[PDB]
PDB file of C-alpha atoms in Angstrom:
ATOM      1  CA  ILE A   1       5.008  15.002  11.468  1.00 15.91           C
ATOM      2  CA  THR A   2       6.641  15.407  14.841  1.00 15.90           C
ATOM      3  CA  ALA A   3      10.647  16.042  15.371  1.00 14.48           C
ATOM      4  CA  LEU A   4      13.046  18.203  17.127  1.00 18.15           C
ATOM      5  CA  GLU A   5      15.924  18.265  14.730  1.00 19.69           C
ATOM      6  CA  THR A   6      13.936  20.017  12.705  1.00 19.18           C
ATOM      7  CA  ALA A   7      13.895  23.748  14.690  1.00 21.58           C
ATOM      8  CA  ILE A   8      17.876  23.862  13.451  1.00 20.02           C
ATOM      9  CA  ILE A   9      16.413  22.843   9.487  1.00 20.25           C
ATOM     10  CA  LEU A  10      13.513  25.363   9.541  1.00 23.31           C
ATOM     11  CA  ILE A  11      15.201  28.066  11.017  1.00 22.31           C
ATOM     12  CA  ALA A  12      17.376  28.044   7.687  1.00 27.65           C
ATOM     13  CA  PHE A  13      14.930  28.071   5.221  1.00 26.16           C
ATOM     14  CA  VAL A  14      12.522  30.664   6.671  1.00 25.47           C
ATOM     15  CA  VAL A  15      15.963  33.120   6.865  1.00 28.91           C
ATOM     16  CA  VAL A  16      16.839  32.021   2.957  1.00 30.68           C
ATOM     17  CA  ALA A  17      13.479  33.309   2.303  1.00 31.55           C
ATOM     18  CA  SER A  18      13.049  36.136   4.206  1.00 32.28           C
ATOM     19  CA  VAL A  19      16.959  37.338   2.688  1.00 32.80           C
ATOM     20  CA  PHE A  20      15.164  36.449  -0.782  1.00 29.92           C
ATOM     21  CA  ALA A  21      11.946  38.427  -0.374  1.00 29.84           C
ATOM     22  CA  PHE A  22      13.972  41.597   0.932  1.00 31.70           C
ATOM     23  CA  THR A  23      15.692  42.024  -2.467  1.00 32.30           C
ATOM     24  CA  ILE A  24      12.559  41.215  -4.622  1.00 29.63           C
ATOM     25  CA  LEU A  25      10.844  44.739  -2.993  1.00 26.91           C
ATOM     26  CA  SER A  26      14.708  46.458  -3.195  1.00 26.94           C
ATOM     27  CA  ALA A  27      14.541  45.253  -7.027  1.00 27.46           C
ATOM     28  CA  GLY A  28      10.782  45.996  -7.745  1.00 29.46           C
ATOM     29  CA  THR A  29      10.619  49.174  -5.936  1.00 32.01           C
ATOM     30  CA  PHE A  30      13.809  50.511  -8.551  1.00 32.10           C
ATOM     31  CA  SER A  31      12.662  48.397 -11.659  1.00 32.23           C
ATOM     32  CA  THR A  32       9.122  50.104 -10.829  1.00 29.06           C
ATOM     33  CA  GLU A  33      10.496  53.793 -10.549  1.00 25.96           C
ATOM     34  CA  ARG A  34      12.577  53.247 -14.096  1.00 27.39           C
ATOM     35  CA  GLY A  35       9.428  52.970 -15.621  1.00 24.36           C
ATOM     36  CA  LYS A  36       7.886  56.104 -14.529  1.00 22.46           C
ATOM     37  CA  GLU A  37      10.655  58.616 -15.933  1.00 20.90           C
ATOM     38  CA  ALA A  38      10.428  56.804 -19.394  1.00 23.80           C
ATOM     39  CA  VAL A  39       6.648  57.487 -20.268  1.00 26.87           C
ATOM     40  CA  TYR A  40       7.922  61.454 -18.416  1.00 25.10           C
ATOM     41  CA  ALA A  41      10.559  61.969 -20.718  1.00 26.38           C
ATOM     42  CA  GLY A  42       8.536  60.724 -23.779  1.00 24.90           C
ATOM     43  CA  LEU A  43       5.541  63.033 -23.128  1.00 21.14           C
ATOM     44  CA  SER A  44       8.317  65.751 -23.156  1.00 18.99           C
ATOM     45  CA  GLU A  45       9.388  65.553 -26.455  1.00 16.07           C
ATOM     46  CA  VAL A  46       6.247  65.583 -28.594  1.00 18.04           C
ATOM     47  CA  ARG A  47       5.688  68.294 -27.041  1.00 16.39           C
ATOM     48  CA  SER A  48       8.621  70.546 -27.138  1.00 15.87           C
ATOM     49  CA  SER A  49       8.529  71.286 -31.085  1.00 12.26           C
ATOM     50  CA  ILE A  50       8.534  74.968 -32.347  1.00 14.82           C
ATOM     51  CA  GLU A  51       7.792  76.360 -36.213  1.00 15.21           C
ATOM     52  CA  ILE A  52       8.861  79.565 -38.299  1.00 16.26           C
ATOM     53  CA  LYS A  53       6.808  82.096 -38.427  1.00 18.26           C
ATOM     54  CA  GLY A  54       6.873  84.805 -40.630  1.00 21.76           C
ATOM     55  CA  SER A  55       8.945  85.703 -43.779  1.00 22.54           C
ATOM     56  CA  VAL A  56      12.926  84.968 -44.309  1.00 21.80           C
ATOM     57  CA  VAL A  57      14.934  87.893 -44.712  1.00 20.65           C
ATOM     58  CA  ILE A  58      18.163  87.937 -46.871  1.00 21.08           C
ATOM     59  CA  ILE A  59      20.503  91.147 -46.067  1.00 19.53           C
ATOM     60  CA  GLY A  60      23.489  91.821 -49.007  1.00 17.30           C
ATOM     61  CA  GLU A  61      26.598  93.604 -48.381  1.00 19.11           C
TER      62      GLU A  61
ATOM     63  CA  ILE B   1      12.914  25.486  -0.878  1.00 19.67           C
ATOM     64  CA  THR B   2      10.379  27.222  -2.717  1.00 19.78           C
ATOM     65  CA  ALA B   3      12.725  30.414  -2.883  1.00 17.12           C
ATOM     66  CA  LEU B   4      15.491  28.568  -4.812  1.00 16.21           C
ATOM     67  CA  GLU B   5      13.048  27.648  -8.028  1.00 14.79           C
ATOM     68  CA  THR B   6      11.144  30.648  -8.134  1.00 14.82           C
ATOM     69  CA  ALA B   7      14.550  32.288  -8.908  1.00 14.43           C
ATOM     70  CA  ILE B   8      15.100  30.422 -11.828  1.00 16.77           C
ATOM     71  CA  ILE B   9      11.854  31.022 -13.104  1.00 15.09           C
ATOM     72  CA  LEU B  10      11.708  34.292 -13.055  1.00 16.20           C
ATOM     73  CA  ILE B  11      15.464  34.909 -14.505  1.00 16.22           C
ATOM     74  CA  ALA B  12      13.496  32.758 -17.552  1.00 17.92           C
ATOM     75  CA  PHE B  13      10.855  35.033 -18.042  1.00 17.23           C
ATOM     76  CA  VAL B  14      13.005  38.641 -18.014  1.00 20.98           C
ATOM     77  CA  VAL B  15      15.238  37.449 -20.277  1.00 22.22           C
ATOM     78  CA  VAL B  16      12.127  36.649 -22.948  1.00 20.53           C
ATOM     79  CA  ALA B  17      11.058  39.649 -21.815  1.00 18.30           C
ATOM     80  CA  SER B  18      14.077  41.070 -23.478  1.00 16.06           C
ATOM     81  CA  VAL B  19      14.666  39.072 -26.059  1.00 18.10           C
ATOM     82  CA  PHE B  20      11.108  40.568 -27.181  1.00 15.41           C
ATOM     83  CA  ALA B  21      11.397  43.618 -26.326  1.00 16.49           C
ATOM     84  CA  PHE B  22      15.175  44.165 -28.880  1.00 18.64           C
ATOM     85  CA  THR B  23      13.140  42.678 -31.902  1.00 20.14           C
ATOM     86  CA  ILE B  24      10.081  45.212 -31.357  1.00 18.48           C
ATOM     87  CA  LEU B  25      12.502  47.717 -31.005  1.00 18.10           C
ATOM     88  CA  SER B  26      14.573  46.966 -34.245  1.00 23.48           C
ATOM     89  CA  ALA B  27      11.447  46.123 -36.085  1.00 26.19           C
ATOM     90  CA  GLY B  28       9.871  49.044 -35.133  1.00 24.76           C
ATOM     91  CA  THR B  29      12.375  51.517 -36.661  1.00 23.28           C
ATOM     92  CA  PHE B  30      12.717  49.298 -40.262  1.00 23.17           C
ATOM     93  CA  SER B  31       8.823  50.811 -40.426  1.00 25.59           C
ATOM     94  CA  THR B  32       8.906  54.128 -39.437  1.00 25.55           C
ATOM     95  CA  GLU B  33      11.534  54.541 -42.213  1.00 24.72           C
ATOM     96  CA  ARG B  34       9.154  52.593 -44.864  1.00 22.79           C
ATOM     97  CA  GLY B  35       6.942  54.969 -43.995  1.00 22.76           C
ATOM     98  CA  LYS B  36       9.140  58.026 -44.739  1.00 25.01           C
ATOM     99  CA  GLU B  37      10.433  57.100 -47.596  1.00 22.99           C
ATOM    100  CA  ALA B  38       6.470  57.053 -48.757  1.00 22.25           C
ATOM    101  CA  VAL B  39       6.046  61.174 -47.984  1.00 23.83           C
ATOM    102  CA  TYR B  40       8.769  61.977 -49.978  1.00 23.65           C
ATOM    103  CA  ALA B  41       8.691  59.872 -52.889  1.00 24.04           C
ATOM    104  CA  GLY B  42       4.378  60.696 -53.257  1.00 24.91           C
ATOM    105  CA  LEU B  43       5.749  64.570 -53.294  1.00 24.40           C
ATOM    106  CA  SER B  44       7.956  64.390 -56.305  1.00 21.19           C
ATOM    107  CA  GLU B  45       6.052  63.123 -58.583  1.00 19.85           C
ATOM    108  CA  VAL B  46       3.397  65.290 -58.307  1.00 18.88           C
ATOM    109  CA  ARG B  47       6.166  68.879 -58.999  1.00 16.74           C
ATOM    110  CA  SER B  48       7.734  67.164 -61.723  1.00 14.55           C
ATOM    111  CA  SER B  49       5.467  68.344 -64.834  1.00 13.91           C
ATOM    112  CA  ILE B  50       6.178  69.788 -68.436  1.00 14.46           C
ATOM    113  CA  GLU B  51       4.423  72.310 -70.661  1.00 13.72           C
ATOM    114  CA  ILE B  52       4.780  72.865 -74.098  1.00 14.99           C
ATOM    115  CA  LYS B  53       5.334  76.731 -75.138  1.00 12.32           C
ATOM    116  CA  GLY B  54       4.811  77.805 -78.954  1.00 12.35           C
ATOM    117  CA  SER B  55       3.834  76.296 -82.253  1.00 14.95           C
ATOM    118  CA  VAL B  56       4.401  72.779 -83.570  1.00 14.84           C
ATOM    119  CA  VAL B  57       6.360  72.873 -86.554  1.00 13.37           C
ATOM    120  CA  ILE B  58       6.830  70.837 -89.651  1.00 15.58           C
ATOM    121  CA  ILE B  59       9.930  70.466 -91.710  1.00 16.45           C
ATOM    122  CA  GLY B  60       9.282  68.782 -95.414  1.00 18.30           C
ATOM    123  CA  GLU B  61      12.011  66.839 -97.148  1.00 16.19           C
TER     124      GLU B  61
END
């Protein structure tokens, strides 16, 4: 459980994990944020309908 | 070390999720169409009646 050459090796893995962690954070932020406009967009369509009102009139020339 | 494997398992689930998402996307469209025809078919049947006007006449040989 004791060695000196392990010093170089341990530095390699901690760097890789840190870089990998960085990518996950950025990817997670992008992924989660795409989620929210999907629901925000969805509420818009169901609300946006219009309706005809009155009676239709036709004019002859 | 642990960073390397978690990449592989991560890719596995996103692919399964996407494939399931595509299938559940594809299936939802089909079910929607069938429900639409039922309403159209039902309305047409109710409005297709026929009456009888006048008397009934017998011609004797």
